[PDB]
Write a structure and sequence with these properties.
part of a larger assembly; 9 chains; A alpha+beta; B alpha+beta; C alpha+beta; D alpha+beta; E alpha+beta; F alpha+beta; G alpha+beta; H alpha+beta; I alpha+beta; E: 2 helices; 7 strands; globular; H: Glutamine Phosphoribosylpyrophosphate, subunit 1, domain 1; five-stranded antiparallel beta sheet
Chain lengths: 250, 241, 231, 240, 111, 235, 243, 195, 244
């Protein structure tokens, strides 16, 4: 009994590749398309809710997740791997930051902690790498809005806009033609919906699309009043109805 | 080809041990089905007792996890009981730690997390089982949540599992296309059970006696399994129709 | 073949080849015989030397005043197992003021050997043991094998060419079982048994080892000039 | 903890991981020790595919273990740092408990012990390093020179070389070193050391290092010019 | 507070002659002003011609004697039935006693 | 690969058998027991003429009454000697007496099979352990990496061993004097050694009840070498 | 392939071949059975007499757990002992915490989970025994059979070892002919007959019969060995039926 | 133990440390040197609990000597004093704290300046022109406050130290058996043999 | 058991080389080139980013150049995530030293400890090595300006000028040709950029594919300043040396 696997399962091949990382990236390639776009006054992250059966309640499966009140995550690749990474990311935001400084971590640093967790699954004994690429969108007072990609290796890059998964090559090209540094948040949501339609096969509506924003503070989502400096989460998930509204003016 | 013996990625990004654990799921050759009423959640599973020497009362793939949660398993019984004991322990610990009964979906997520770990950690094999959790949750109402060896889980309007799962799934799909609603529009759990058995018969094209089935029912504040006589009573009502 | 790399691996026909190879080491070991009456139990062992300049390897080990054993195979494993038995007999005395029943001694050795057959990293013990003793239910002889199988017998033999002694004891059963209250006759029968396993070699004075335990006899070992009486 | 028996016996009775560690030593730059009547000299090759090297700060090939003992090596550089550190710690621990600095034999025996331990412990590979350990015992004027290798065996040498082409410089030393008359001076001992490296090195420009150790903690490294004086003088007497 | 020690009284006496030695002790065992036993032996034959008494707190005395007797047994097992000489027994008992230096056996030991 | 503690189909431990092959590559060591003492001798076998032969230490003291010679991977012997010395000194501390030679040897041999997946491999060195105690007198033991030890009247180990052992089989008798044993070790060493035996490439030692374990100077051994050459030329 | 070389590895058809290989070791063992009766259970086993030298009556195979449970097994005997040793630890800790002696279904799962645990890692070997066990608790009699995979069920009758098919066929006749139930004393006799009938599949060596039972009326709900007159009576009934 | 004093003058640090070792009602030694050289230009004196003092002093010495060999470099007096402070700060919350007070007198060769650090057993460090531990300060500080000047020569420093020892020998109850005096400057550490 | 699946990351080849170290070096040879050049009045660090996309946020980016303390920086060639693990360790180590001695850590001491950690992964533990090579640029009052490199073996060396990553063979040849000892920082800057310009696998060297930094005494008297160049500053210096 107990782990006899105290040795690495990811190792360098003679050509210098790390096989398991490459293969994890291949699993991400098969994954459903997800994307992020950075506007001047906000960020949008979006993905298709590829449903497994029509008997499944796809609302119960949320691909876009709140990590902190100002940071959200989406992914492409293996769903179960993503789910546990969200659990760990939420916790590490507290244990390694909020319980120390009494405030939530800035986007880059929470991203840095997730990247660390994913890197250790590439070197530690008896584990495989995570089979997901993450897109993390957030806001913090001193850096403003930001968008990050985190890959199986633990590498992360800041983006203006990008896509990952199935039709990422086509989607990145579409985003290069459309992105400028003057985009307002509502313009970015519009571009995100256009981009996603190219990669979505079947129905394209607010029940098959998942989309969240990092934007203005939402005092109506705070749950209490009386502390002026507490203004509410900047993360908001758009409802099924709110998405359909934007799809008529498409 | 050691990438097929343990849970590491193959060159095409697959986990063969997870895939082979899925094939173990059908090894018992048993089909299960779950639906929701207004007030209840019903789960039915085939009961096959091939050996005459068995005590048929001990042959079961349905488990009472907590007072409110039931679970049916598709897969070998040793792995099934492993999952059942852990789920019971987890549900009991949750209540002690947090002061309220563990919700069906939260237990499903927890078991799915444990399963995910076996797909990432080398020394633990995946369990060759699919776990369907059912309850009448105090917040969410009648609930079906299902877990697999990949560590995936999701909620369902209704669901089916086993070798002939596709037939039952399309049968249930077609009914809800017609009915236009998320559940069986029926007051009594007795009639929801009757619906469940009726649609299993049609989908599988087989008749059932009282010993060919196994039934679990979830209502507000309790999950319970039916006796052969309760099921016989139910089969009779289906026939007189 | 492909299934003999470690003890933790079953072969396709359900065999444990590492345990079987451990059994093989016993078969290469020098012959040792065990037999008993209702009043005494006797071990007889043929000792083996390296060459004409060397000593003869001891085969018999005392475990308590009322219990002891003989070995065939890997001698260091017999040292480990006999030491465990010494401790178990000792624990029984100190804690319960009770001499350890030979039967329990057998159960304890079985379970100790078994653990080495079910986990990775270890190896099975490479030694067979013949345990004799006199306890509250009389004289006893046990045969231990490193597979974990322990068996209570009237008489037996293990080691190279042990088949001859075993056949002889099987024939002589009705006679030697009733050699009560006569140590020298029980030993003589044992010496005759071990002679059925000899080949191009005969029993000499620094070759032969005998042990006896019984009703009013503590486990005592006879070596050298003290076994001339029996040659 | 990681456990694998990496150093094990093969059917012919060799420990391949120990023997392959010797191959790593054979690849390392040449190191040579020669002991005179009143000193020991340690000479070391430095490979010349590296121009743009900063020699102020680049790790020197000869290391002081204490103020009276030095250590040079051939093989994996990173491995040697671990042996050097352990030796330095033990040297101070010896001074602390015994109230006397280590003897050269003692320090060598310790280093050799560490190396041996890494040949029969689980989860570790042997050191890809052989060392030359030289100096003078406290209050003693007899020069000391020892060699260790990855297996853990160690011995005393009148003169010895290790590393690449060491078989060529051992050749030289064997026919040029008289046991009856060791180099009677520092001058003579440094010269024999430089000659032996010139059999193998190339142009003795920035290629050769020399360190001279005398009794009572008298250790000094030569500069390029001082070494170059020997190189120049050796090549003039060469034309014959 | 629990006091782990007691006093069982009794007295012992050892004298050595030219080719013999005696070790004597009374057989009374007491606590406070009561007699526990009029005959409870505290001088024991430990094998190898060694007699021993550990007098004071009887529970500690019995423990030590028991441990030493066991030591004689294992000395035979480990050193080819060699006889344990009295001087070797004495040194062995020193280590048995000193091993509990910071929680002592409350006994005057004589062999 | 395959487990380090694996049995072969013939019932022997692969690793122990392979370590025995390494011992066969070791330099020759010989021991002869007499009623006047036990003599231990070794071939030093320096790999180069520049190596100072007095630094080759293949004969070693364990206690005043116990000595030890080695053959094989000699670096493996250091921790064995360290255990032996500690075992011997510890016994004297606990029992105010000398520890028996057999008990010492049994204690060293207890280390042998303490390997697996404990150390990573068996020892690659055989020991000849020679000593005196009051119970069993002068004794010689051959300690192997199998954990087995045999008592010997005379024994050779190392590369020249099987030729040397056949020679010891003919020459040994129960009435040999110490001087006869010294000359005999030298004689058989010169036979199996590659190079010419002299006082620098071979070493002698003995253990007597009176003076304990002693390694001989090169001067003392040199005279016994001259004495051996004179006896052999004299018929 | 190579899927069968390591325990806990799934083959492409979803099987653990090492457990299946453990089953082969069980099929190689001697015959053991269990019969469930009116108010209890009866266990019996075939003991091959390898030689005259084996002391009769003195190599006991059936084992008691606590004071109310009997266990018997076929295959690798030491593996069976290991399992019972664990079962005894499990029963002791149950009684320690809850006071009441461990119920048979509870005890059944304790063994089940433990055996199943030995199919989860490559660093342990599966158990090479099938174990028939049971007894009487507050809810009546229970008989169980447990396999190397950790799979177990409740049984009316059970058999394993080399003569399992013969024994099973004979068990089915009793179940068919006695729907109302077999008595404890009758079950002992039948167990003797069945072991003799199952010995045909292992007929080279002759054998020794061993029987135990737990009955609410006959043994007061405690596990006891059948010896002496009751045992000879059962042996005679068995001899009388093969002829 | 008991008396340790220190004076930093223009070009040197001077340490004076008492010679007596007293246990019970007996003076066991009257030539004890309560000092260890940590590096060629750094000297540490010490006083406090028996056993603890020497054990700590030698432990620090071994560590600084190890550093010197590793880096082929002498650590600055400031750096050494910070290392020593941290060790004492660690110690005050261990199971059994070192009860040792030290003075560190060093000559910084990079700065060309003498430096005197006073550190107590709690790890309270302070750089001073002159320092003392225990009851010594109660007599010497006021005297030093009056006569001390920062540009004094080594000679003047020794005369000022003489005045302190004289006052201690008059008013202190215990006989501390004189002092050993050592000077730390640019040339290293030397001992005055007639005080 | 699990022996079957163990690569044995810490063993010698028959030639006496460490397989995993060699293969990690092979990995690093595909990483974007990084150059360090040491001058009499400062140090230059220059590094080429890995084939950047137009949508990458360049100003809030860090991939090649990291700050260890106020006096020491590193350029990275290899797996970035592996480097960050080691960088955070180095940052802590620097602070431990500062806390212990109240002095900034000497460059070599920091370099030795990082290199020792790398070495450990090659000798024990059975884990893959860190696929990273560093160029260390730093200043202390003992040796002044210093350059070092370390690689997956944990071997480290000091340099006047050095490259790591892709095309080090060509890059080193060019540095060896044009480097001279008396050289000032502004000359070193030019050499660094002109070297990357000639060895790059891209069509043309631009500001968006570069990270750049200098360590000068360019503040106020005996005090050292680290300048991590902003994108616009890299664009300017690229023009000022006539590469764009």
């Amino acid at each position: 009994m107990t782990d006899r696997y105290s040795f690495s399962l990811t190792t360098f091949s003679p050509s210098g590749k790390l096989g398991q990382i490459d293969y994890a990236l291949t699993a991400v390639k098969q994954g459903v398309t997800s994307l992020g776009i950075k506007a001047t006054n906000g960020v949008v992250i979006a993905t298709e809710k590829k449903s497994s059966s029509p008997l499944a309640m796809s609302e119960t499966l949320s691909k876009v997740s709140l990590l902190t009140p100002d940071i959200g995550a989406v992914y492409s690749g293996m769903g179960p791997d993503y789910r546990v990474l969200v659990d760990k990311s939420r916790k590490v935001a507290h244990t390694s930051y909020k319980r120390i400084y009494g405030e939530y971590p800035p986007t880059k640093l929470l991203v840095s902690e997730v990247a660390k967790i994913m890197q250790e699954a590439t070197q530690s004994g008896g584990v495989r790498p995570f089979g997901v690429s993450l897109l993390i969108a957030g806001h913090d007072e001193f850096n403003g809005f930001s968008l990050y990609q985190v890959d199986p290796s633990g590498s992360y890059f800041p983006w203006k806009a990008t896509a990952i998964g199935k039709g990422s090559v086509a989607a990145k090209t579409f985003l290069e033609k459309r992105w400028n540094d003057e985009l307002e948040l509502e313009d970015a949501i519009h571009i995100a919906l256009l981009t996603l339609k190219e990669s979505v096969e079947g129905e394209f509506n607010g029940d098959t699309i998942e989309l969240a924003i990092i934007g203005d503070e939402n005092p109506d989502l705070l749950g209490y009043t009386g502390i002026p400096t507490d203004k509410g989460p900047r993360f908001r998930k758009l409802t099924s109805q709110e998405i359909n509204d934007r799809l008529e003016a498409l | 080809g050691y990438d097929r013996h343990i849970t590491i990625f193959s060159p095409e990004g697959r986990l063969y041990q997870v895939e082979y654990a899925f094939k173990a799921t059908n090894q018992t050759n048993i089909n299960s089905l779950a639906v929701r009423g207004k007030d209840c959640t019903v789960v039915i599973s085939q009961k096959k007792v091939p050996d005459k020497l068995l005590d048929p009362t001990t042959v079961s793939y349905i488990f009472c996890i907590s007072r409110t949660i039931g679970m049916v398993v598709n897969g070998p019984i040793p792995d099934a009981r492993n999952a059942a004991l852990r789920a019971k322990a987890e549900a009991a610990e949750f209540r002690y730690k947090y002061g309220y009964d563990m919700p069906c979906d939260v237990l499903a997520k927890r078991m799915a997390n444990l399963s995910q770990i076996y797909t990432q950690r080398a020394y633990m094999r995946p369990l060759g089982v699919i776990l369907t959790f059912v309850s009448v949750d105090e917040e969410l109402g009648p609930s079906i949540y299902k877990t697999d060896p990949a560590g995936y889980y999701v909620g369902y309007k209704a669901t089916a599992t086993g070798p002939k799962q596709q037939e039952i799934t399309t049968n249930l799909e077609n009914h809800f296309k017609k009915s236009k609603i998320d559940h069986i529009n029926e007051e009594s759990w007795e009639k929801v059970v009757e619906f469940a058995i009726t649609h299993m018969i049609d989908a599988l094209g087989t008749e059932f006696s009282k010993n060919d089935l196994e039934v679990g029912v979830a209502t507000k504040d309790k999950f319970f399994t039916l006796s052969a006589e309760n099921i016989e009573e139910r089969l009779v009502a289906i026939a007189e129709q | 073949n492909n299934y003999d790399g470690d003890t933790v691996t079953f072969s396709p026909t359900g065999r444990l080849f590492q345990v079987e190879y451990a059994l093989e080491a016993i078969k290469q070991g020098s012959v040792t015989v065990g037999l008993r009456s209702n009043t005494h139990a006797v071990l007889v062992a043929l000792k083996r030397n390296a060459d004409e300049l060397s000593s003869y390897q001891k085969k018999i080990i005392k475990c308590d005043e009322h219990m002891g054993l003989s070995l065939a195979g890997l001698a260091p494993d017999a040292r480990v197992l006999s030491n465990y038995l010494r401790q178990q007999c000792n624990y029984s005395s100190l804690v319960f003021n009770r001499k350890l029943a030979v039967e329990r001694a057998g159960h304890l050795l079985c379970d100790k050997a078994q653990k080495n057959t079910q986990s990775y990293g270890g190896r099975p013990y490479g030694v067979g043991l013949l345990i004799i003793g006199y306890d509250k239910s009389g004289a006893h002889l046990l045969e231990f094998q490193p597979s974990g199988n322990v068996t209570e017998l009237y008489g037996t033999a293990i080691g190279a060419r042990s088949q001859g002694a075993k056949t002889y004891l099987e024939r002589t059963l009705d006679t030697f079982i009733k050699i009560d209250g006569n140590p020298d006759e029980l030993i003589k029968a044992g010496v005759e048994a071990i002679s059925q396993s000899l080949r191009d070699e005969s029993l000499t004075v620094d070759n032969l080892s005998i042990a006896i335990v019984g009703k009013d006899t503590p486990f005592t070992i006879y070596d050298g000039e003290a076994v001339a009486k029996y040659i | 903890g990681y456990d694998r028996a990496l150093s094990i016996f093969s059917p012919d009775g060799h420990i391949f991981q120990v023997e392959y560690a010797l191959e790593a030593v054979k690849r390392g730059t040449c190191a040579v020790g020669v002991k005179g009547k009143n000193c020991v000299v340690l000479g070391c090759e430095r490979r010349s595919t590296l121009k743009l090297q900063d020699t102020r700060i680049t790790p020197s090939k000869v290391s002081k273990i204490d103020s009276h003992v030095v250590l040079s090596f051939s093989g994996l550089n990173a491995d040697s740092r671990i042996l050097i550190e352990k030796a330095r710690v033990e040297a101070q621990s010896h001074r602390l408990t015994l109230e006397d600095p280590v003897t050269v034999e003692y320090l060598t025996r310790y280093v050799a012990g560490v190396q041996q331990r890494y040949t029969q412990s689980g989860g570790v590979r042997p050191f890809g390093v052989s060392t030359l350990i030289a100096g003078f015992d406290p209050r003693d004027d007899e020069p000391k020179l020892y060699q260790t290798e990855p297996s853990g065996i160690y011995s005393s040498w009148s003169a010895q070389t290790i590393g690449r082409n060491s078989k060529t410089v051992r050749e030289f030393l064997e026919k040029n070193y008289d046991r009856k008359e060791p180099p009677a001076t520092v001058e003579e001992c440094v010269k024999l050391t430089v000659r032996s490296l010139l059999e193998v090195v190339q142009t003795g420009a920035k290629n050769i290092e020399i360190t001279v150790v005398k009794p009572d903690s008298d250790i000094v490294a030569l500069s390029s010019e001082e070494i170059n004086q020997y190189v120049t003088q050796i090549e003039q007497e060469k034309q014959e | 507070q629990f006091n782990p020690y007691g006093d069982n009284g009794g007295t012992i006496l050892g004298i050595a002659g030219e080719d013999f030695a005696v070790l004597a002790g009374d057989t009374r065992n007491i606590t406070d002003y009561s007699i526990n036993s009029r005959y409870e032996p505290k001088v024991f034959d430990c094998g190898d011609n060694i007699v021993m008494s550990a007098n004071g707190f009887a529970a500690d005395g019995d423990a030590l004697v028991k441990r030493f007797k066991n030591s004689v047994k294992w000395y035979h097992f480990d050193h080819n039935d060699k006889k344990l000489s009295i001087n070797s027994a004495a040194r062995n008992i020193q280590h048995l006693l000193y091993g509990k230096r910071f929680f002592p056996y409350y006994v005057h030991t004589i062999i | 690969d395959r487990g380090v503690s694996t049995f072969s189909p013939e019932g022997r431990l692969f690793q122990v058998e392979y370590s025995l092959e390494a011992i066969k590559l070791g330099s020759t060591a010989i021991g002869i027991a007499t009623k006047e003492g036990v003599v231990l001798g070794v071939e030093k076998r320096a790999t180069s003429p520049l190596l100072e032969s007095d630094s080759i230490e293949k004969i070693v003291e364990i206690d005043r009454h116990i000595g030890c010679a080695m053959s094989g991977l000699t670096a493996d012997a250091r921790s064995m000697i360290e255990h032996a010395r500690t075992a011997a000194v510890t016994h004297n501390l606990y029992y105010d007496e000398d520890i028996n030679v057999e008990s010492l040897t049994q204690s060293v041999c207890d280390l042998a099979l303490r390997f697996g997946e404990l150390m990573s491999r068996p020892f690659g060195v055989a020991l000849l352990i020679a000593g005196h105690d009051a119970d069993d007198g002068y004794q010689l033991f051959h300690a192997e990496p199998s954990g087995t030890f045999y008592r010997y009247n005379a024994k050779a180990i190392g590369s020249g061993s099987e030729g040397a052992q056949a020679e010891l089989l003919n020459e040994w008798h129960s009435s040999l004097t110490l001087k006869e044993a010294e000359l005999l070790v030298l004689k058989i060493l010169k036979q199996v050694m590659e190079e010419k035996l002299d006082e620098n490439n071979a070493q002698l030692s003995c253990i007597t009840k009176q003076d304990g374990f002693k390694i001989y100077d090169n001067e003392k051994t040199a005279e016994l070498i001259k004495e051996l050459k004179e006896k052999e030329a004299a018929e | 392939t190579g899927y069968d070389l390591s325990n806990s590895v799934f083959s492409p058809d979803g099987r653990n071949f090492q457990v299946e290989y453990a089953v082969k070791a069980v099929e190689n063992g001697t015959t053991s059975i269990g019969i469930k009766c009116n108010d209890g259970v009866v266990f019996a086993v075939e003991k091959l007499i390898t030689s005259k030298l084996l002391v009769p009556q003195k190599n006991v195979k059936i084992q008691v757990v606590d004071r109310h449970i009997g266990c018997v097994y076929s295959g690798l005997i030491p593996d069976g002992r290991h399992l019972v040793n664990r079962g005894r630890e499990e029963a002791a800790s149950f009684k320690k915490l809850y006071k009441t002696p461990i119920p048979i279904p509870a005890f059944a799962d304790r063994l089940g989970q433990y055996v199943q645990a030995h199919t989860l890692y490559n660093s342990v070997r599966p158990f090479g025994v099938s174990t028939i066990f049971g007894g009487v608790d507050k809810n009546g009699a229970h008989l169980y059979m447990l396999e190397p995979s950790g799979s177990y069920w409740g049984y009316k009758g059970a058999a394993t070892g080399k003569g399992r098919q013969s024994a099973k066929a004979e068990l089915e006749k009793l179940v068919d002919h006695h729907p109302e139930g077999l008595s404890a004393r009758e079950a002992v006799k039948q167990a003797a007959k069945i072991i003799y009938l199952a010995h045909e599949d292992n007929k080279e060596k002759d054998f020794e019969l061993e029987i135990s039972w737990c009955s609410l009326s006959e043994t007061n709900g405690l596990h006891k060995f059948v010896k002496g007159d009751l045992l000879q009576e059962a042996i005679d009934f068995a001899q009388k039926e093969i002829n | 133990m008991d008396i340790i004093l220190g004076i930093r003058v223009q070009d040197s640090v001077i340490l004076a440390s008492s010679k007596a070792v007293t246990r019970g009602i007996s003076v066991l030694k009257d030539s004890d040197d309560k000092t260890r050289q940590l590096s060629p230009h750094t000297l540490m004196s010490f006083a406090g609990e028996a056993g603890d003092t020497v054990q700590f002093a030698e432990y620090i010495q071994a560590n600084i000597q190890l550093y010197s060999i590793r880096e082929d470099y002498e650590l600055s007096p400031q750096a050494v004093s910070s290392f020593v402070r941290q060790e004492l700060a660690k110690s005050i919350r261990s199971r059994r704290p070192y009860q040792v007070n030290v003075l560190i007198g060093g000559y910084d060769k990079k700065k060309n300046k003498p430096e005197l650090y006073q550190i107590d057993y709690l790890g309270t460090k302070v750089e001073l022109p002159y320092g003392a531990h225990g009851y010594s300060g109660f007599y010497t500080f006021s005297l030093l406050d009056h006569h001390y000047r920062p540009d004094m020569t080594t000679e003047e420093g020794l005369d000022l130290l003489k005045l302190c020892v004289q006052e201690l020998e008059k008013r202190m109850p215990m006989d501390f058996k004189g002092v050993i005096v050592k000077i730390v400057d640019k040339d290293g550490i030397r001992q005055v043999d007639d005080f | 058991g699990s022996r079957r699946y163990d690569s044995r990351t810490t063993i010698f080849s028959p030639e006496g080389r460490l397989y995993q170290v060699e293969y990690a070096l092979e990995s690093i040879s595909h990483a974007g080139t990084a150059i360090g050049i040491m001058a009499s009045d400062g140090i230059v660090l220059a590094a080429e980013r890995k084939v950047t996309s137009t949508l990458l946020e360049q100003d809030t980016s860090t991939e090649k150049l990291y700050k260890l303390n106020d006096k020491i920086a590193v350029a990275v060639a290899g797996l970035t995530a592996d480097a960050e693990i080691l960088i955070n360790t180095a940052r802590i180590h620097a602070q431990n030293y500062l806390k212990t001695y109240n002095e900034d850590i000497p460059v070599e001491i920091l370099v030795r400890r990082l290199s020792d950690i790398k070495q450990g992964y090659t000798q024990h533990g059975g884990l893959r090595p860190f696929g990273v090579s560093f160029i260390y640029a730093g200043y202390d009052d003992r040796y002044g300006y210093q350059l070092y490199t370390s690689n997956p073996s944990g071997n480290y060396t000091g340099w006047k000028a050095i490259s790591v990553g892709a095309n080090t063979s060509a890059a080193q040849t060019l540095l060896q040709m044009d480097y001279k000892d008396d050289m000032k920082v502004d000359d070193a800057i030019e050499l660094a950029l002109k070297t990357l310009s000639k060895t790059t696998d891209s069509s043309a060297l631009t500001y968006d594919r570069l990270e750049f930094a200098t360590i000068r005494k360019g503040a106020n008297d005996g005090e050292v300043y680290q300048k991590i160049f902003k994108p616009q500053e890299i664009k300017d210096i690229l023009v000022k040396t006539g590469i764009t």
